[PDB]
Write a protein that binds this ligand. Sequence first.
Ligand SMILES: [Mg+2]
Ligand SMILES: [Mg+2]
Ligand SMILES: [Mg+2]
Lengths: 149, 149, 149
Amino acid sequence: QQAADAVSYDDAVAALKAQQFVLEANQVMFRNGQTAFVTSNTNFVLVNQGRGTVQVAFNTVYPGPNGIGGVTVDGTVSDIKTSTDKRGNINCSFSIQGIGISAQIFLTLTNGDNNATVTINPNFNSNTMTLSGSLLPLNQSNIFKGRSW
Amino acid sequence: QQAADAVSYDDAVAALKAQQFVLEANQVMFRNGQTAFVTSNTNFVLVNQGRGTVQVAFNTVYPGPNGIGGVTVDGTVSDIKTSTDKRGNINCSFSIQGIGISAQIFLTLTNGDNNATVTINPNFNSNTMTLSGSLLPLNQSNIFKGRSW
Amino acid sequence: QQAADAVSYDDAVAALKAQQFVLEANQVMFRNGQTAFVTSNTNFVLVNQGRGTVQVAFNTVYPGPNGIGGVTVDGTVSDIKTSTDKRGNINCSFSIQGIGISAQIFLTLTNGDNNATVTINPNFNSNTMTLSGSLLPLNQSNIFKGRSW
Ligand SMILES: [Mg+2]
Ligand SMILES: [Mg+2]
Ligand SMILES: [Mg+2]
């Protein structure tokens, strides 16, 4: 269990370094500390060298306008910034630019496992969405492998 | 320890399904990620079939107006919405309607234990309170058992 | 590992009770549930009897104005409020008063370890910063020991 997570962490770090990764989200996180589960099939961030896709779509039991949200941006990846601390925690940012729409992305990975948290900020208003899930190399991602891109 | 939590989870799930449960809170959670402890005797959500009671009352060392809060609503339970993911995480919402006052409730339970987080939204303003604690069947709740309702 | 944290907790509690402690922060916490790592050398709260110093300075990969912040206040400690629950969790507040500037501090310590979370609220605007890290007695703090105060 501990060795299984440690290898996943190494794989996640190598995937970030290759710029070939998918964050497959399984929950949305709310400002008050609450969470709700979401489907990974339409909640992910995929980066494959200079191209990327973010898709978010949740319709949850969290009542009211904050419990439903989403965006899709498919295009080019730019402005990659990365920092790693002495413990192996990674903080990374980048933007995905589509046609008439973009999203700014901030991703954090804690040492020891491949759970990562991502904040997605679309360009059209000041609101953002924060999700968490598994950071995977492309070849271990069912999202990546389930279609021809 | 692991088997003790697993049974508590099963008990919590059966209690939600019976609509006979109490969430006994032991902390209040703040938007900035802070917490403060609270007394369970006046910080709970009780549902017993079509009737329910929410009582929240905290007066904490968290400085300023956000560190003190509360509401009491005693009445009928309505609009129950429930969803369960493939991992056994549960997201649930409902309202408690009193006389001239109501509260909308959102409750989440993670698989493997009976710790749950609840957000309480009274009808009179847009503010909300988020607490966490133990989700219990009525017959295991000292809140339920300590008085005749 | 469990006994190592338990002793650290006892040491942290004795340090708070002596009013001789340093919280050495290693991350900043964001309202959306994100975190970013920070350097401890300029991110700490030191209390030594009636005198204290808070220094915060982070310049992180979290994009935009919320990912950079800081304050330094060096002066006197006042208005100490402390509460401890039946489980050994501690919630504490106090202010550090400098010349023309002050900060209100809220610190929480969970039983069983010396990880603590602190919120710092400078007097000049309504914004605040929340960080987490290790709560240490003065004689175990490299911050304290690295200079003559
Ligand atoms: Mg936006
Ligand atoms: Mg309200
Ligand atoms: Mg302030």
